[PDB]
């Protein structure tokens, strides 16, 4: 009676969630563009209609692959550079005394030591100004890296500035993008498109502040895997950027001293001018209005009458306890306590934060690999945007109306999850079987 | 220029989506980072070749819409033609018979084998 027969369809529009290996579409630097595919000048976007797809921000395989790829790129770029094993000698250090300011006291020390030279059977006495965080007492000091592992001095030519890296899928795979505004990263997105490649994702590294991130088009947005549970972090994406400018006013000098045949070590010379602490300014009014938006959006979830307390970082290592970022060839560790110090209940001045500059950089929370950064000649200024935040709720006795959110971080996946929250990877299955009145022969 | 409307008919009904199968078929083929790209390409090639072999084993080689001679058992789906080709989309249909796929493939395979054997027997005479 049915007289229905199987029919095979090829090229069917059906897909399933899957994980694969994406590659570059970038258009000398640490983020190697040569080992990255070039993109087309006319990217194609196909906006699917009457389809709703279940997105999940916290189960995306794109962010883990991006983290692994960034680590691999960092290691590959650091491999062809001088290894500073001879520079683990004992240092005779004294405090600086010329043009020293009160803030920059108990700080960069004039150290002198013997080091090898081009000729093996000879030594040279050299001097350099080493920041306090780099050196540690055994009137003699040793670098902090000495008992952990040797450093690979980052080569001067390669620049650390982020460069966008457009991710793409291989053949037979598609990148779905959720255009639905006010999308919280999880659940059914009704507005779906297919993109040949992702947008320009700048591989910026930072903690407590997502610098140069993607801005929300609607308002401040709060995202969390489980907002009820305080263990999981909370990502806040702003709708407008807060302009922030950091600077190291000291006019440092770089001197190259030969530690071996070909290998040359770059050292700090004379601090031309006055020794002043590196400082970073952020607008007070812009910060106030942005914080107002954040507290409103957080009250949307945590109640319309609860008190919102923002306090400085709890504690731990320097990298996670302070806003640590990199720009202009220098790594700053600015202390964010004046920003996240306020309580909320139902003109031209700006907040100035102090910044400490390290050289021995143990990034990626890895042990056994350090990244002594050569000094940068001249004064460094760095203007950037703040468009994100990573906040953690202090659980425990917060069952009452009290709510205390503090800056967090440590893991760099949250930085990548704020820009890949809309991209998902699917695999197509062209084969399909249906009923039809056909009959072969 | 080849991408130019990949998928697109995902939200369309099965009957309408069956009219744009070509656009979804052209895009199914096209130190350690060279290995990454190479492995991606080889995986895509292997998947495409497996799909083509599966199509060929059923006798549908070189056809996008090829319908066989095996019957549609009512146990797989009681939905009728008026409610499947004009009221349901391809994703829902795939999710509905996701667990009744292997037996259909086996039936198609054995039917094609029997058809080829019958053709050989008839042509031998």
């Amino acid at each position, epitope marked *: 009676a049915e007289n229905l027969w199987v029919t095979v369809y090829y090229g069917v529009p059906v897909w399933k969630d899957a994980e694969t290996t994406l590659f570059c579409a970038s258009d000398h630097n640490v983020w190697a563009t040569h080992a990255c595919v070039p993109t087309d000048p006319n990217p194609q976007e196909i906006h699917l209609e009457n389809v709703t797809e279940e997105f999940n921000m916290w189960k995306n395989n794109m962010v883990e692959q991006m983290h692994t790829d960034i680590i691999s790129l960092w290691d590959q770029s650091l491999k062809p550079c001088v290894k500073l094993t001879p520079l683990c000698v004992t240092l005779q250090c004294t405090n600086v005394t010329n043009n020293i300011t009160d803030d920059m006291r108990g700080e960069l020390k004039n150290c002198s030591f013997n080091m090898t030279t081009e000729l093996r059977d000879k030594k040279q006495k050299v001097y350099s100004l080493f920041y306090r965080l780099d050196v540690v007492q055994i009137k003699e000091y040793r670098l902090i890296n000495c008992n952990t592992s040797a450093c690979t001095q980052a080569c001067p030519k390669v620049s650390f500035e982020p460069i966008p890296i457009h991710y793409c899928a291989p053949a037979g795979f598609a990148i779905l993008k959720c255009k639905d505004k006010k999308f919280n990263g999880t659940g059914p997105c009704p507005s779906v498109s297919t993109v040949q490649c992702t947008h320009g994702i700048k591989p910026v590294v930072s903690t407590q502040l997502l610098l140069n991130g993607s801005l929300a088009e609607e308002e401040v947005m709060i995202r969390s895997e489980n907002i009820t549970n305080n263990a999981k972090n909370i990502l806040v994406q702003f709708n407008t950027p807060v302009q922030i400018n950091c600077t190291r006013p000291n006019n440092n000098t770089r001197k190259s001293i030969r530690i071996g045949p070909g290998q040359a070590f770059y050292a700090t010379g004379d601090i031309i001018g006055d020794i002043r602490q590196a400082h970073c300014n952020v607008s007070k009014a812009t910060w106030n209005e942005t914080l107002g938006k954040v507290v409103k959006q957080l009250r949307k979830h945590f109640g319309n009458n609860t008190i919102i307390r923002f306090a400085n970082s709890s504690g731990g290592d320097l990298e996670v306890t302070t806003h640590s970022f990199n720009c202009g060839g220098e790594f700053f560790y600015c202390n964010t306590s004046g920003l996240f110090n306020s309580t909320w209940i139902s003109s031209n001045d700006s907040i100035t934060l102090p910044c400490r500059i390290k050289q021995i950089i143990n990034m990626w929370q890895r042990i056994g690999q350090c990244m002594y950064a050569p000094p940068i000649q001249g004064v460094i200024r760095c203007v950037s945007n703040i468009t994100g935040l990573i906040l953690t709720r202090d659980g425990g006795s917060t069952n009452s109306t009290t709510e205390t959110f503090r800056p967090g971080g440590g893991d760099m996946r949250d930085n990548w999850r704020s820009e890949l929250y809309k991209y998902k990877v699917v695999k197509i299955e062209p084969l399909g079987v249906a009923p039809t009145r056909c009959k072969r022969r | 220029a080849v991408f130019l409307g990949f998928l697109g*008919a995902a939200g369309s*009904t099965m009957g*309408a989506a069956s009219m*744009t199968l070509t656009v979804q078929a052209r895009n199914l083929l096209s130190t350690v980072w060279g290995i990454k790209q190479l492995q991606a390409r080889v995986l895509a090639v292997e998947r495409y070749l497996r799909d083509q072999q599966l199509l060929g084993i059923w006798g549908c080689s070189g056809k996008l819409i090829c319908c066989t001679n095996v019957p549609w058992n009512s146990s797989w789906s009681n939905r009728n033609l008026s409610e499947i080709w004009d009221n349901m989309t391809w994703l829902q249909w795939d999710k509905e018979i996701s667990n009744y796929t292997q037996i259909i493939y086996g039936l198609l395979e054995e039917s094609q084998n029997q058809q080829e054997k019958n053709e050989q027997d008839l042509l031998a005479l």
Partner: antibody
Amino acid sequence: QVQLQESGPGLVKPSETLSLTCAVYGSSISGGYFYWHWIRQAPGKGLEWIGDVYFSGTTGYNPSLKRRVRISADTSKNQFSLNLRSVTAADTAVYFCARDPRGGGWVPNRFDVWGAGVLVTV
Amino acid sequence: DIQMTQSPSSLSASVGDRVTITCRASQDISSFLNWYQQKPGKAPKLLISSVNRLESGVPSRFSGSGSGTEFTLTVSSLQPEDFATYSCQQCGSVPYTFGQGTTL
């Protein structure tokens, strides 16, 4: 956010080809889900269908203007164009470009989103 | 080429009052009718589709009824922004012809 914008000469000598390009920001012409129509409305009159174009080039024009009109859709830059030849005084009208969710058998001709509407006097 | 006639060709009413507009087709179009709305200046906006099915995003006051060769659009309570030119459509056969347009 999906919309359409029309461009072209707003005034033309009434004997030559009249070109009007409608470009859509939002959905894509390449996707086989929407037909792209070219509804017209003269002053003091009702709407009047002219023609439609699909992603595969299977276009269909009004029987009244099956000879004087040609609709060409280019998906590389995601737009379409109406070329109305031998324009006369009867073509003084507002030329809307509309989107039809006929692609997919969910609904029949259901013009939902309309362009801004350019008045091409002649 | 089905021809559509809207009755009345033009009417005037007062706010908060019922109004009804009839549409007649020369042939039988089954239930393939969509009621549109064109505020002056801007482009037409769809109000109703398939005679009775109300499109998402309109006030519930609008309603449609009828079948065969006769259809009707009813507004239960007139509102200040409901002073646009309603139209008809033939959404069941090429070519699609609209109505003359009744101005409120």
